[PDB]
């Protein structure tokens, strides 16, 4: 069972070819992976245990049925095919092997006891983690008479005491020395099934995963992962004293591999080292697409290809996916400086607001979707819970902190009583949060960006009242936003006809990987710095805004807006990779700021 499998696995690792494409035939697929493992660190080999289903079917039966008696063989059989690069680079730890599956295999509700101790894949949304927990591997005993120190190994899963000193023979004198032994790490994590893939009218479950030595801190609460690992069940004892164990066991999952890369969402900020892993064939494409005179309107108009025209809102929601520069103000003692853009959408019903939130939330990774009445003051930022076991108050993170890199869509913005609405004042302007409760006195921080949607008061935009009266929001909250989009319902018959003609079409029946990579690039290698010709159009663009917004009674302008223009201007320059802010990048993001409130 042991020798018969490494011989059958090495073959796979050597002679395998796929009808696929990687990193944007180079036959030695896993040998190329094994070469990359040698040119850099990171001694892990991510093998797909479905490729081993094409090449073979009698190991793919024994990998998902006896995974703990196979994966050591899959390590050994990789160490030897590392012969090519043995003399070149000599790392130390060992080489590893990690089977996985591109697609899930089960739910959290259909785990049956014919699946105990066999490879299994699920998916969920990590809720909370814990601090490290040691776990002994090699004991270290020592006698009180002979003072002789033997070092017994844990082989089966328990530690046995020798009871005979190899020198003095006192038949029990070998104490266990703790801090001279060897330990390894162990973390406890909790999943939670996704809203999709659950039965009719039911509440989410949780499942406990146990990480191990190297996967110990590779995931954060608020992430959506595809965990792959063995499924085990261990007994429990009714007393912590007697050996009367129960008969209903208790199950967890010894994780073996994570996967956070989903196809449909953009690139999360773990792949900044992976941006240097772009095909140089692709950087040409991006730099050349960034030269056409309207690449702005050509990318924007490719957001949500189901909304009707609404041309400006897609412009704003596209500039929000880039954000101003990340300047470093630690020297001036000013503090930090927000670089993300907050957008508010107000307008009478039926105008397709909630569809834009539902579309963005499904686009960006690391996001959330909240509502009006089903969210409280502390549930959005940070609460304090009586931890069940240790009976102590511990801090947790809300929704505005779990996003932290992404967008926090807050629908039904009007229908939140003024208490829970005055909480956003801190987290959305300073990018911080200062907590001072019973035993916890700390200061979090996040890099979120709200995208809110509200209805006018009376839910009907009556043009008798003033713009600062249909919204009915204060000024200390309207100024923290910088793009207040007033959608309206004009009764032009031509518009209604075109819209209906468009909507009916949804009943019969640019690319993404251009946008999905253009964005990663424009994040990685761009930093627009202002100029002196641009800076001289930014001063007057604020001295006129005051005289304009003063009289009309629409929405006043405070110096904070003058920073928003910066935030917008720079964010425009990033679209075209211009690396330097010029004049037009202020006129555009000034016309945008003016022609949204009309």
């Amino acid at each position: 069972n042991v020798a018969a499998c490494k011989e059958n696995f090495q073959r796979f690792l050597q002679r395998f070819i796929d009808p696929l494409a990687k990193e944007e035939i180079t036959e030695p697929l896993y040998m190329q992976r094994l070469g990359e493992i040698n040119v850099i660190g990171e001694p892990f080999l991510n093998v797909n245990c479905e490729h081993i289903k094409s090449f073979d079917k009698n190991l793919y039966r024994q990998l998902i049925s006896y995974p703990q008696e196979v994966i050591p063989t899959f390590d050994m059989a990789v160490n030897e095919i590392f012969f090519d690069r043995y003399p070149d680079s000599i790392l130390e730890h060992q080489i590893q092997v990690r089977p996985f599956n591109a697609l899930k295999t089960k739910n959290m509700r259909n785990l049956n006891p014919e699946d105990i101790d066999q490879l299994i894949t699920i998916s969920g949304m990590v809720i909370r983690t814990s601090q490290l927990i040691p776990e002994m591997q090699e004991a270290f005993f020592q006698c009180q008479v002979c003072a002789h120190t033997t070092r017994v190994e844990m082989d089966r899963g328990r530690i046995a005491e020798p009871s005979v000193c190899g020198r003095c023979h006192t038949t029990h004198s070998m104490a266990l020395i703790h801090n001279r032994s060897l330990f390894s790490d162990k973390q406890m994590i909790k999943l939670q099934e996704s809203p999709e893939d659950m039965p009719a009218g039911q509440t989410p479950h949780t499942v406990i995963l146990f990480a191990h030595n190297d996967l110990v801190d590779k995931v954060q609460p608020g992430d959506r992962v595809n965990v792959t690992g063995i499924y085990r069940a261990v007994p429990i004892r009714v007393n912590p004293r007697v050996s009367n164990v129960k008969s209903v066991y208790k199950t967890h999952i010894d994780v073996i591999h994570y996967r956070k890369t989903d196809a449909k969402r953009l690139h999360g900020l773990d792949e900044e080292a992976e941006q240097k892993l772009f095909s140089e064939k692709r950087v040409e494409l991006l730099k050349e697409l960034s030269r056409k005179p309207d690449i702005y309107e050509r990318l924007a108009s490719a957001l949500a290809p189901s909304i009707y025209e609404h041309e400006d809102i897609k412009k704003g929601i596209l500039l929000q996916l880039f954000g101003g520069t990340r300047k470093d103000f630690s020297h001036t003692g000013r503090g930090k400086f927000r670089a993300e853009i907050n957008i508010l959408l107000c307008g009478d019903p039926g105008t397709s607001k909630s569809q834009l939130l539902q579309y963005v939330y499904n686009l960006v990774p690391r996001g959330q979707y909240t509502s009006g009445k089903g969210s409280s003051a502390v549930g959005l930022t940070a609460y304090v819970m009586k931890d069940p076991e240790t009976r102590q108050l511990v801090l947790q993170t809300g929704a505005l902190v779990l996003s932290d890199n992404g967008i926090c869509c807050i629908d039904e913005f009007d229908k939140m009583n003024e208490s829970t609405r005055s909480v956003l004042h801190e987290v959305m302007e300073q990018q911080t949060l200062s907590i001072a409760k019973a035993g916890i006195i700390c200061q979090l921080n996040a890099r979120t960006s709200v995208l809110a949607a509200a209805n006018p008061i009376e839910s009907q935009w009556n043009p008798k009242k003033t713009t600062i009266e249909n919204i009915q929001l204060p000024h200390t909250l309207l100024s923290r936003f910088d793009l207040i989009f007033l959608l309206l319902d004009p009764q032009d018959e031509a518009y209604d006809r075109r819209l209906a003609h468009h909507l009916v079409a949804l009943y019969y029946q640019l690319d993404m990987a251009v946008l999905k990579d253009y964005i990663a690039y424009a994040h990685s290698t761009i930093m627009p710095r202002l100029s002196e010709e641009a800076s001289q159009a930014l001063i007057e663009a604020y001295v006129d805004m005051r005289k304009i917004g003063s009289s009309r009674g629409m929405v006043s302008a405070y110096p904070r807006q003058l920073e928003s223009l910066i935030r917008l201007a720079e964010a425009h320059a990033k679209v075209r990779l211009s690396n330097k802010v010029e004049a037009i990048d202020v006129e555009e993001a000034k016309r945008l700021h003016r022609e949204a409130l009309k």
Partner: protein, 598 residues
């Protein structure tokens, strides 16, 4: 004695005939034993009415003991299986046997089962609560002596058990007088298991008494049948718990049947007959059902035409990742005493999954979902509301104008996106609530009056008024002769307790509840050639309600009514494409809903 019973059961298992198989006299258990011998089946629901057909004595002594007999049967089948086709005779069982209640017994209530029926076959009815999740329960623990290379087993009965440290094989002990043996979760055998509580129907309780509970240990194959908050009927032994003389008791389920419909679950027998396809194929099948909905109520020929579309429901799309709901919501604004709380009470009983709620007796967190703490553990858990428990069905809210205004905006979420997004201080999730709502309300101050226009003797904010595809508006103006027919109807009802016999007869409730479930799964399409007709209709609407002095707030959410109110009709006529004759029916409905004002 029992040695002669193990033969009187083998006789019955090998000899029993049955005619209703639709063929000749075959063997009900003759085929079953073969299937079980080929490991294509796990459970064998030995009915007891069939033993009570040729031996009404054995039934008397089964329901008297039912604990020995459920073992004699599992020995009889254990012997018969090889004759058709390890050491302990239980590790190689791989099937289980369950008694299906005898018809002569009567279903007790939870309060009735007393101590005089401990250890007998009983039958209870109740509401499920706190169903656990499946966990592996051990049956035959398999140990191994690694030293002497052997295998040993032990069978478990209690909810606890003490392991072994012997290796009682006299050879291993005799040779060396030393050796320990490890437990092992491979050679052992688990079985699914979950516990769930039952409560009395709060209806069948003394006027002000507290309901009593019982515990049910579902295991084997009956798992995952029952959902929490559910009407169920259970059949199983009633035993005491192991480990002074007082004893706590649980019900050990042998058979679980859902009785939601007030009779049974007949999803297996739910197929229609050609003699019913006769009716369903008639010209006006759509018009028979409409008249056979709450026949006790005179008039309202059109309202019953829409309350059927609500039960059938349109189709739901998903283009370019932009969900569109496929349910219909309906309100019944109207004067007092027009039988609205009768129509709703009827549509409650004609739905597989339904819920009934009153506006003045239900809070906004009790509709959607509530987070509540456990003073035993201090842990906050989620608890579904009304709209969650009515996931794939219908919810009914009468007295809808009297619901508190902060407890009513908690429905705007469930009516469009059909999720519930909770971000309180224990939980952060989105439950699925795909319910279609039906509500009733009184217009202004009890009675419509012709002085004030609409929208002021209705008092709904446009944002909520537009969520309803059909806000039906009923009036009652006195009529010297219509009152006469209404009275001659109601007095007939109070004489005979039935409705007067019209030309034809209403279908039974049991039969319509099947006619509809067959009529849901069609999914018709839309033809392109119609997009010009539909369009014009919609345009015309935006004219009238823009050039009138009474009309409501119409928006681009009205077009999707016309669209989704026609895929319902085309779904009744069993077509697989929407035809120009149904668009006009839909358009007539959306017009016959406000004519009661002219």
């Amino acid at each position: 004695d029992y040695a002669l019973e193990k033969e009187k059961v083998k006789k019955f298992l090998q000899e029993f005939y049955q005619d209703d198989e639709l063929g000749k006299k075959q063997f009900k258990y003759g085929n079953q034993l073969v299937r079980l011998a080929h490991r294509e089946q796990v459970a064998l629901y030995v009915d007891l009415d069939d033993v009570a057909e040729d031996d009404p004595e054995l039934v008397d002594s089964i329901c008297e003991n039912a604990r020995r007999y459920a073992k004699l049967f599992a020995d009889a089948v254990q012997e018969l299986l090889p004759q058709y086709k390890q050491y302990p005779a239980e590790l190689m069982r791989r099937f289980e046997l369950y008694f299906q209640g005898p018809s002569s017994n009567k279903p007790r209530v939870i309060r009735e089962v007393r101590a005089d029926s401990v250890g007998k076959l009983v039958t209870v009815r109740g509401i499920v609560t706190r169903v656990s999740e499946v966990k592996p329960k051990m049956v035959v623990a398999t140990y191994t002596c690694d030293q002497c290379g052997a295998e040993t087993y032990q069978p478990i009965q209690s909810p606890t058990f003490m392991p072994l440290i012997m290796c009682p094989s006299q050879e291993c002990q005799t040779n060396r007088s030393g050796g320990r043996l490890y437990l092992q979760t491979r050679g052992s055998r688990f079985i699914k298991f979950q516990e769930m509580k039952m409560q009395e129907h709060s209806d069948q309780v003394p006027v002000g008494n507290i309901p009593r509970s019982i515990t049910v240990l579902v295991e084997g194959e009956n798992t995952r049948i029952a959902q929490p908050g559910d009407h169920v009927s259970v059949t199983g032994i009633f035993l005491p718990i192991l480990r002074g003389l007082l004893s706590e008791t649980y019900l050990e389920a042998h058979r679980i049947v859902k009785m939601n419909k007030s009779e049974d679950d007949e999803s297996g027998a739910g197929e229609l007959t050609r003699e019913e396809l006769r009716q369903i194929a008639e010209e006006d099948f759509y018009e028979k059902l409409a008249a056979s909905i709450a026949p006790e109520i005179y008039g309202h020929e059109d309202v019953k035409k829409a309350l059927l579309l609500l039960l059938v429901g349109g189709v739901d799309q998903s283009p370019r990742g932009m969900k569109i709901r496929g349910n219909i919501n309906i309100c019944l604004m109207g004067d007092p005493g027009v039988a609205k709380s009768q129509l709703l009470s009827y549509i409650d009983r004609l739905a597989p999954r339904s819920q009934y709620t009153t506006g003045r007796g239900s809070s906004g967190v009790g509709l959607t979902a509530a987070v509540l703490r456990d003073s035993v553990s201090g842990e906050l858990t989620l608890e579904g509301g009304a709209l969650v428990l009515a996931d794939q069905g219908v919810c009914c809210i009468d007295e809808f104008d009297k619901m508190a205004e902060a407890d009513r905006t908690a429905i705007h979420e469930v009516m469009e996106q059909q999720t519930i997004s909770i971000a309180k201080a224990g939980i952060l999730t989105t439950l699925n609530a795909r319910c279609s709502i039906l509500a009733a309300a009184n217009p202004a101050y009890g009675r419509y009056n012709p002085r004030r226009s609409l929208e002021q003797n209705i008092q709904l904010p446009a944002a909520l008024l537009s969520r309803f595809d059909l806000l039906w508006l009923i009036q009652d103006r006195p009529d010297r002769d219509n009152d006469l027919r209404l009275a001659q109807h109601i007095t007939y009802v109070h004489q005979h307790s039935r409705q007067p016999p019209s030309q034809f007869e209403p279908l039974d409730m049991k039969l319509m509840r099947r006619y509809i479930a067959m009529c849901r799964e069609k999914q018709p399409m839309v033809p392109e050639s119609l997009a010009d007709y539909i369009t014009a209709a919609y345009v015309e609407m935006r004219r009238e309600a823009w050039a009138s002095k009474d009309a409501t707030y119409t928006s681009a959410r009205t077009l999707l009514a016309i669209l989704r109110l026609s895929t319902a009709l085309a779904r009744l006529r069993m077509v697989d494409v929407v035809e120009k004759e149904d668009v006009n029916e839909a358009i007539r409905l959306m017009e016959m809903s406000k004519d009661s004002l002219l």
